[PDB]
Design an enzyme around this catalytic site. Structure first.
Site: not given
Ligand SMILES: NC(=O)c1ccc[n+]([C@@H]2O[C@H](COP(=O)([O-])OP(=O)(O)OC[C@H]3O[C@@H](n4cnc5c(N)ncnc54)[C@H](O)[C@@H]3O)[C@@H](O)[C@H]2O)c1
Ligand SMILES: NC(=O)c1ccc[n+]([C@@H]2O[C@H](COP(=O)([O-])OP(=O)(O)OC[C@H]3O[C@@H](n4cnc5c(N)ncnc54)[C@H](O)[C@@H]3O)[C@@H](O)[C@H]2O)c1
Lengths: 310, 311
Positions: B121, B146, B206
């Site tokens: 992140s 997180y 927020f």
């Molecule tokens: N969106 C952002 O701005 C952002 C920024 C930096 C990091 N990230 C990282 O990118 C990745 C994707 O996040 P996103 O934004 O697509 O959110 P998202 O919630 O759409 O994707 C996360 C996915 O992981 C799945 N998941 C969660 N726990 C699980 C488990 N125990 N077993 C299997 N699948 C599981 C969820 O069902 C979901 O499909 C994550 O690692 C998140 O921490 C996101």
């Protein structure tokens, strides 16, 4: 103060309990006897300033326990301690060392605990650094799941400090030895040598015997725990060692000298880190901590303990 | 390549699946639908190069799954992503983000996987950094559970790299936005604002709206995942962002401008764990990977609004 020590039935933990009681504190001990021993605490049976709670940090209601006992400082020594076991089962190691720590912090931030003193691993968190003796400023580079979990625990506690102002400091011991150490694992090599040599059983040096560690006596480690428990060194790790390197072969000799008889170990194929040596300057500057016990003396004390168990 | 994507039913995950398929790879998606949605993947029902596995990374037999599919690269995007929930339940967060990662690495090292691309992140791992834009050489200082779990994830993967030669790289995105983002999530404000303003429903920031984030479009993020999947950046993190700061207030204004109608968000109390500023130095990704973001905020915002208009 009111203190609670997790891993209290263990080598360092039970020793810390004794010291805290001697300093006039009330002490709650907590352990699930994963590796700990009832005999480590049995002498406290009728000491009313001590209470023992059997609990697994992974699953126990730590919130309810801390709510009940209201410790001012939690000394966190409960851990999966074996490097080799961590490789065989990193999930189990991570559950105890990471999840366990997180659950404890989450309980402590809700129950008015002032500080958690965490136990890291000075001997393993640095991997192979370019600086010996190694200062805390050297980057962590863990080479085992055990070492990684210790680092992760530090970071989570630092996080709780930011979030809630739950104070934390990380005691990072080198190779701890002394009375009550279990003669098992690569950690307890002093205990292993002492018990074997006293018996007259074979002893094994794994490799050419040149590998070095920094051997620190348990009482010195315990004193560091007491010092750091105060409102000092917030979010900081403290290397707790002697800053002197002792080879496997030299260690054998020191135990052999204490025991008497032959200094003639078996040499086996190499199993791990080649060197470990901690810079202990920060602990001196910030805590006024210095190790009192040099190896030859410490080993004699340790062999004395094993004489009476044999 | 044979790829496996955890979190494949998610926002970035489903987008990554699409890109890998388009590049001609075989893709196994894996998800437990914790926050992901079957509808993010439903267009792949008759895609012959894709298979889906419903599984929880915390509890499933990942060894068996990897043994069957033999992915060369695992793109690890499965995670608990909500900062607020990480505060409310740090244990659960750690279970998914740390234990889950550990279980995946332990499975991968036994099943001949070449590389895991982790998702860190970029927005949170540095806490309050010494300078903006922030390079990867800045120390991690997580200020939410997180953020801590993500840092812990990187460290464990680095360890497995040392132990087994299971290669890894850490993609550390800033604020990712675009089509398929959860509009009822926590901090995916482009999606939340787009859906709400299109519906004439209330929107909230927020704090006082001054907090800044670095907004990077999903397609650009996905490209970085693909580049880093090769034998490059072993053991390294790469900041994936634009190096431009947009305030919560400015972000809202941008969405409202695209939607039309009012630009009047509610100001709520600040959230425990949230940082004041975030801005990534992306020099390393550019030099090492040849990666640069293509999609500017205004353009990306339009693309997002239109997704939510028609869905
Ligand atoms: N969106 C952002 O701005 C952002 C920024 C930096 C990091 N990230 C990282 O990118 C990745 C994707 O996040 P996103 O934004 O697509 O959110 P998202 O919630 O759409 O994707 C996360 C996915 O992981 C799945 N998941 C969660 N726990 C699980 C488990 N125990 N077993 C299997 N699948 C599981 C969820 O069902 C979901 O499909 C994550 O690692 C998140 O921490 C996101
Ligand atoms: N001995 C060394 O050289 C050394 C050096 C650096 C770090 N450490 C750390 O010092 C601490 C004490 O280790 P030690 O040498 O006294 O070993 P030990 O095994 O004697 O002490 C560990 C104690 O923790 C308990 N424990 C384990 N899992 C538990 C759980 N889930 N719930 C509750 N209690 C649990 C064990 O039963 C045991 O009593 C550990 O955190 C260890 O990682 C030891």
């Amino acid at each position: 103060m009111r203190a609670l020590v997790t891993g209290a039935a263990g080598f360092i933990g039970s020793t810390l309990v004794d010291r805290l009681l001697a300093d006039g504190h009330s002490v709650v001990g907590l352990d699930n006897f994963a590796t700990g021993r009832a005999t480590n605490l049995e002498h406290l049976a009728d000491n009313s300033a001590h209470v023992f709670v059997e609990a697994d940090i992974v699953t126990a209601d730590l919130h309810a326990i801390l709510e009940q006992h209201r410790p001012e400082v939690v000394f966190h020594l409960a851990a999966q301690i074996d490097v080799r076991r961590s490789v065989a089962d990193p999930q189990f190691d991570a559950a105890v060392n990471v999840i366990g720590t997180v659950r404890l912090a989450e309980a402590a931030r809700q129950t008015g605990v002032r500080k958690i003193v965490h136990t890291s691993s000075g001997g393993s968190i640095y991997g192979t650094p370019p600086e010996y003796p190694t200062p805390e400023t050297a980057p962590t580079d863990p080479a085992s799941p055990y070492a990684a979990g210790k680092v992760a625990g530090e970071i989570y506690l630092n996080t709780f400090r930011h979030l809630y102002g739950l104070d934390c400091s990380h005691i990072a011991p080198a190779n701890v030895y002394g009375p009550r150490q279990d003669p098992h694992g690569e950690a307890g090599v002093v205990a292993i040598f002492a018990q074997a040599l006293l018996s007259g059983k074979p002893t094994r040096v794994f490799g050419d015997g040149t590998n070095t560690r920094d051997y620190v006596f348990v009482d010195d480690v315990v004193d560091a725990f007491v010092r750091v428990s105060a409102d000092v060194g917030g979010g900081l790790r403290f290397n707790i060692g002697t800053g002197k390197e002792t080879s496997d072969r030299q260690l054998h000799s020191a135990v052999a000298a204490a025991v008497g008889g032959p200094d003639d170990p078996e040499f086996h194929p190499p199993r791990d880190l080649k060197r470990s040596c901690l810079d202990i300057g920060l602990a001196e500057r910030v805590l006024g901590w210095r190790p009192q016990i040099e190896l030859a003396d410490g080993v004699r004390r340790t062999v004395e303990y094993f004489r009476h168990k044999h």
